[PDB]
Amino acid sequence: GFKQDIATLRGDLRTYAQDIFLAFLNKYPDEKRNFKNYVGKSDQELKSMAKFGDHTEKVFNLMMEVADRATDCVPLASDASTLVQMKQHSGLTTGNFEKLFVALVEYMRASGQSFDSQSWDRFGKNLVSALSSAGMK
């Protein structure tokens, strides 16, 4: 289930983090605007960029902790506030996070693994609720 998926992803996180985030940037090209340094590069070129690997993994490092700390796929208000108040998230809307979890759930459904895809969809919807409650537009 959801808690087991956190262990599955964590066991190969750098791989999952890159593949999921690449699926996100490819499904939603306009999101590369928030990552100007990724425009005009293929997946393999991004996977060889140091900042891409490190940052994408750090994103998923924290995302798994937010998911780990959640109760019934509802994240703690503190994690939501942390995400909203980060300097690097100033200028991001709920739609940004909304699209990341669309790509995440679609990636899980297409992986053919036993991910609890419905729980991650809920987790993303609830995280968006918490992000809006914490002050994100």
Q: Which positions make up the binding site for heme b?
A: 36-37, 51, 55, 58, 88-89, 97
Residue 74's SS3 state is strand
Distance of CA 34 to the CA centre of its chain: 14
Q: How far, in Å, CA of 43 to CA of 63, rounded?
A: 22
Residue listed under structure tokens 């959640």: 70
Fill in the DSSP letter of residue 90. T
Q: Which residues are annotated as a binding site?
A: 36-37, 51, 55, 58, 88-89, 97
3 state SS of 34: helix
Distance CA 88, CA 90 (A): 6
Q: Are 93 and 137 in contact (CB under 8 A)?
A: yes
DSSP-based three-state secondary structure for 71: strand
